[PDB]
């Protein structure tokens, strides 16, 4: 199956059936006079074609949206006037083929939200020790919550969402039920009649007057309309399909699923269950169980936002119909589309669920679409997130990965969907299982997909139990899980078994080989670092993989997949043409050097040649972090687990120069720069070539309009777009006036405002697209023209870059050595990288040594192994025996017998490159799959002398983008106070921040080489003094001198 099937199925359900329910609950509207009626024909709603496609919407900073037209019909109640007209109703952004959205020139995903399911839930809270008291809670899809109570005396108390407690008999008689059917419906009437006396028994009219006395001139018709509007009216209370389903399931009713409102029979059944729970029958519910939690994808959230916008729109239409006394209107005059457009734009722009997309590599892109978050509107608050909501539940087994989770403050809140997991039609997560009959795993048909129906009922075994082929389960003890407990039973009592040993983990965790030999924190770190690798120039498949790489590359969307049988007729670097045979030429476009969200490359290369047969499903072109149709995030390099001369000391990394000159770990990064020629009150800003105070050869790369050309090399400080603005104050000091009196020096009316390259960021200009309003474009308001410049650069590996493997072994490169200085093998081949062996047994990631030894056996054989995790089901020490047997078979080659030594298996002799002497002990060598991460040193280095300052506090700004200063926080002040260092602390707080005269005096004294003077009162203290005075406090500073008190003026 597909891995983004939840996003695809939810948007297809919205486009097919979800919007029709909103347009059918919309119609019909009427006026207060009862003379006009407008109803929307929702089934024949139309979608216009988009104005721009994906890439032209990405480069124009627009959305990939369609226009949505709902045809209306105005019927008339005075005469037979039928006015039918297509009405534009709003703009809906369309989901792309990768399952993403394009909102304002950026790719975005709508993550899946996990919430409490609608239905009735019971719990048992208690006193100091006190009485076992039971409480109910009826949760709808949308509307007020009905709760129930029992105290120590046993009073059945019902309350509405925020109100106080009143009696269930008062609620039941407020509905209109007879007192006959109330106690005739109950099983134990003696418990309920105990509450009947202390609370009293009201009449049907007497009950309606005392809810209005508690919910809010006490009246019974007003309270009747009130309760009819709370629970029993449509468009103010929706129980939902899942709510009706779960409420029929818990209370054992066969009520029709079309009814979405609450009925008094349901309240009678809930009262019956709550009363029966006090006599020890029935089961209390769990709030963290995955049977009580459902997943809300992009269909439901769009449906709710469209419901809110349609409520606003019909309020506007009803007001416009009630105000207008003149009839005979058009249907396009009564419909105002702006609240619906505003609601859709608000949902896709400023939601917790609408997230800026992780587009670093295909694995991060695939993992972001399968995230399961518990936060958001209608979900959770991070302050209200305790330990129990972050714990791992036994119902998460197979459905939510226990490993992949954030490490920051939102740990345990944002989860990941597992590999074989699937969300059903009601929103619950289900997992496939093979049937087991008479101790034999069946494996004859499709699996069952149990939706957490396996706790109280079935005995489920994991998919790593030993089993002879086409036969029973061997062994007399099988590990099972049953009633949320782990146990062991006989194989003839096992009901179900898992379908895969990697059913418990997600995709990025299933990318890790020898996972069962590593710690779980290191597996989490390996998954997180696998989502942070940059796509390299020449990607290469791993010598040791697991087997999910091809499916991950197919379902990421970076791979051109064929659709029909055919013969490829034409291949170049931009186009693959194929005629199909089984409108006779399919043209597959190949993207070349596009920019991702994280400023990385999205490049595709052809794989097929001209004139060969193509099967449907054959990979025609592979993406940036993909080669051979499979995922390829890093390279295979030669490791040696040994310490160098302190250069791999504390997780540092020593590499060779071969990884520099062989273009290993070279990546492409494309930066984007944008400038707007705005409209100012003093005059229009113009983009020109004539810039003041700019020399002769600083304009060679600019064109006739003042803009750079494609293919020019730019470095830090080079002009990209020359721009000027008409300054008009002209307040010159006497120094400038005298200097322009002497040397001519006519001061111009414009000033320099050009777009320049920041510090660093050298590269080649590749795209200089310019947008002008009179060319056909339309801009942000107040801007004449907009220039967008794309600058690409090839980044080699560097000292200070981050490097990692698949087992949570990160590190920083600290030295690049020549290959005549690197250690070498007894065939003369030097080592690519030395890793410190002390980082293995303390971090407890042993699987990297298994991976490097198996990769080195596969290097000496040439076979490219593939090993699924949890391979100890096939025997004891299976990974060790596999690795050493393959190393022996690689050493049985006629020229390569130095590869394996039987005296010390994983180790061989290594010689020193500087002296020629062998090392005293044999060293583990291998072929590891190392990755290059986005954390490069060029994005980390920053320095400030003096830049901008803040508005009120007048302290330096923060951030790399605005040349900000480092924050000297309170702990640093404590560290300087624990020393002596009163003068360091005083100059850090005054002449380096928010004392402007001290700033100027210190800079002048350093430039002229003199002593820095004594500072004054800092600026933020005076701000605090004025704020405390504006609060109404007479706070002042005083000075005593020779028997005299006087108030000092700090503002001076």
């Amino acid at each position: 199956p597909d891995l983004i099937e939840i996003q695809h199925a939810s948007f297809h359900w919205f486009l097919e059936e979800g919007l029709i329910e909103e347009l059918n609950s919309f119609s019909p509207i009427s006026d207060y006079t009862g003379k006009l009626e407008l109803h929307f024909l929702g089934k024949d709603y139309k979608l216009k074609q988009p104005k721009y496609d994906v890439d032209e919407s990405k480069r124009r900073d627009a959305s990939y949206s369609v226009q949505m037209y709902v045809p209306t019909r105005l019927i008339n109640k005075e005469t037979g006037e039928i006015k039918e007209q297509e009405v534009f109703i709003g703009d809906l952004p369309l989901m792309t083929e990768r399952g993403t959205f394009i909102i304002n020139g950026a790719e975005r995903v709508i993550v899946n939200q996990i919430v409490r399911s609608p239905g009735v839930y019971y719990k048992k809270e208690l006193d100091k020790n006190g009485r076992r008291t039971y409480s109910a809670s009826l949760i709808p899809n949308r509307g007020a919550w009905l709760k129930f109570e029992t105290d120590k005396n046993g009073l059945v108390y019902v309350r509405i969402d925020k109100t106080r407690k009143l009696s269930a008999q008062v609620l039941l008689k407020a509905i209109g039920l007879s007192d006959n059917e109330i106690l005739d419906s109950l099983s134990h009437p003696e418990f309920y009649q105990k509450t009947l006396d202390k609370e009293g028994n009201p009449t049907e009219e007497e009950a309606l007057v005392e809810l209005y006395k508690k919910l809010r001139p006490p009246t019974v018709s007003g309270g009747q309309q009130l309760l009819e509007s709370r629970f029993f009216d449509p468009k103010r209370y929706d129980l939902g399909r899942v709510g009706r389903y779960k409420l029929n399931k818990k209370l054992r009713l066969n009520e029709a699923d079309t009814t979405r409102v609450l009925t008094p029979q349901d309240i009678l059944a809930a009262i019956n269950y709550l009363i029966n729970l006090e006599f020890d029958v029935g089961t209390t519910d769990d709030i963290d169980h995955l049977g009580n939690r459902r997943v809300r994808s992009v269909g439901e959230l769009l449906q709710n936002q469209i419901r809110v916008g349609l409520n606003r729109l019909e309020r506007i239409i009803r007001e416009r119909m009630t105000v207008s006394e003149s009839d005979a209107l058009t249907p396009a005059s009564l419909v105002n589309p702006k609240p619906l457009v505003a609601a859709i734009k608000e949902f896709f722009g400023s939601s917790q669920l609408s997230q800026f997309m992780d587009q670093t590599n295909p694995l991060a892109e695939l993992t972001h679409k399968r995230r399961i978050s518990a936060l958001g509107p209608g979900g959770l608050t991070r302050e209200r997130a305790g330990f129990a909501v972050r714990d791992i539940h036994p119902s998460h087994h197979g459905r939510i990965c226990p490993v992949e989770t954030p490490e920051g403050p939102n740990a345990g809140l944002i989860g990941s969907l597992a590999t074989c997991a699937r969300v059903n039609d009601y929103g619950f997560i289900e997992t496939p299982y093979f049937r087991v009959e008479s101790g034999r795993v069946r494996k004859d048909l499709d699996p069952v997909y149990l939706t957490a129906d396996e706790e109280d009922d079935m005995r489920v075994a994991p998919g790593d139990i030993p089993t002879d082929e086409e036969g029973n389960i061997i062994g007399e003890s099988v590990p099972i899980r049953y009633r949320q407990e782990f146990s062991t039973t006989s194989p003839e009592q096992v009901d179900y078994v898992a379908v895969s040993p990697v059913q418990i983990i997600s995709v990025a965790t299933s990318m890790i080989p020898f996972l069962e030999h590593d710690d779980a924190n290191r597996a989490l770190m390996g998954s997180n670092m696998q989502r942070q690798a940059v796509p390299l120039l020449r990607p290469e498949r791993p010598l040791v993989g697991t087997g999910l790489e091809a499916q991950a590359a197919r379902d990421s969307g970076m791979v051109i997949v064929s659709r029909t049988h055919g013969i490829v007729t034409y291949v170049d670097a931009t186009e693959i043409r194929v005629q199909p045979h089984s409108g006779e030429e399919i043209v597959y476009p190949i993207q070349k050097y596009q920019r991702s969200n994280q400023d990385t490359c999205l490049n595709q290369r052809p794989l097929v040649y001209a004139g060969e047969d193509v099967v449907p499903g054959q990979v025609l072109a592979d993406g940036s972090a993909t080669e051979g149709g499979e995922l390829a995030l890093g390279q295979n390099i030669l490791v040696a687990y040994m310490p160098w001369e302190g250069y791999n000391y504390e997780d540092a990394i020593l590499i060779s120069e071969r990884l520099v000159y062989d273009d290993v770990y070279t990546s492409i990064h494309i930066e984007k720069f944008e400038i707007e020629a705005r409209q100012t009150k003093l005059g229009p800003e113009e983009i020109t070539r004539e810039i003041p105070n700019v020399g002769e050869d600083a304009l060679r790369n600019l064109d006739e309009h003042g803009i750079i050309r494609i293919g020019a090399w730019v470095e830090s400080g080079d002009i990209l777009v020359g721009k000027v603005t008409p300054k008009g104050e002209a307040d010159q000091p006497p120094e400038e006036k005298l200097l322009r009196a002497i040397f001519g020096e006519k001061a111009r009316d414009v000033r320099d405002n050009s777009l320049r390259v920041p510090n660093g960021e050298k590269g080649r200009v590749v795209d200089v697209r310019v947008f002008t309003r009179e060319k056909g474009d339309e801009l942000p308001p107040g801007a004449n023209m907009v220039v967008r410049i794309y600058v690409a650069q090839k980044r080699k590996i560097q000292v200070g870059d981050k490097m990692a493997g698949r087992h949570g072994n990160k590190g920083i490169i600290s030295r690049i050595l020549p290959i005549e200085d690197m250690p070498y093998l007894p065939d003369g081949r030097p080592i690519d990288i030395a890793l410190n062996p002390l980082g293995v047994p303390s971090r407890m990631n042993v699987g990297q040594v298994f991976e490097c030894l198996l990769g080195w056996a596969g290097e000496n054989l040439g076979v490219r192994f593939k090993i699924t995790p949890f391979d100890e089901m096939y025997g004891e020490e299976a990974s060790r025996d596999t690795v050493h047997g393959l190393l022996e078979e690689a050493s049985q080659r006629p020229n390569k017998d130095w590869v394996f030594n039987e005296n010390h298996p994983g180790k061989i002799q290594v010689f020193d490159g500087r002296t020629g002497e062998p090392f005293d002990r044999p060293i583990t060598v291998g072929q590891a799959y190392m990755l290059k991460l986005v954390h490069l040193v060029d994005d980390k280095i920053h320095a400030r002398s003096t830049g901008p300052y803040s508005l009120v506090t007048q302290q330096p700004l923060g951030g790399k983008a605005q040349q900000g200063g480092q924050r000297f926080g309170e702990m640093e002040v404590w560290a300087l106070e624990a020393y002596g260092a009163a003068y360091i602390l005083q100059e850090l707080l005054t002449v380096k921040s928010d004392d402007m005269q001290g700033r100027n005096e210190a800079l002048n004294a350093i430039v002229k080489g003199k002593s820095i003077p004594r500072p004054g009162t800092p600026e933020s203290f005076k701000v605090l003094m004025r704020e405390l005075q504006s609060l109404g406090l007479d706070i002042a500073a005083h000075k005593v001198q020779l028997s005299e008190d006087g108030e000092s003026a700090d503002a001076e």
């Binding site: 409209q679 107040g782 901008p948 300052y949 803040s950 508005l951 009120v952 700004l957 605005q962």
Partner: protein, 86 residues
């Protein structure tokens, strides 16, 4: 009159509000007439005003934004943290 006199920090006069409403009605009528390619030249024609005056009205019709609004979906950032003192 209280809406047009209060409820805005940089307040606009009443004739500006009536001009904004007239411009809204004129753009919706000329969009009902010409279904595609909206034209500010004909918007300024049907209102008999200058196009830069129309841009001035659309610029003055904007609402201010507070300096205490968070930038991301968290409480770590603020709009006043990016504004340089002049």
């Amino acid at each position: 009159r209280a809406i047009a006199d209060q409820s805005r920090t940089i307040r606009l006069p009443v004739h500006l509000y009536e001009t904004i409403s007239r411009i809204k009605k004129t753009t919706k009528l000329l969009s009902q007439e010409m279904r595609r390619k909206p034209t500010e030249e004909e918007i300024a024609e049907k209102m008999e005003m200058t196009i830069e005056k129309l841009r001035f009205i659309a610029k003055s019709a904007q609402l201010p934004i507070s300096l205490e609004t968070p930038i991301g979906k968290e409480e770590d950032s603020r709009l006043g943290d990016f504004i340089e003192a002049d």
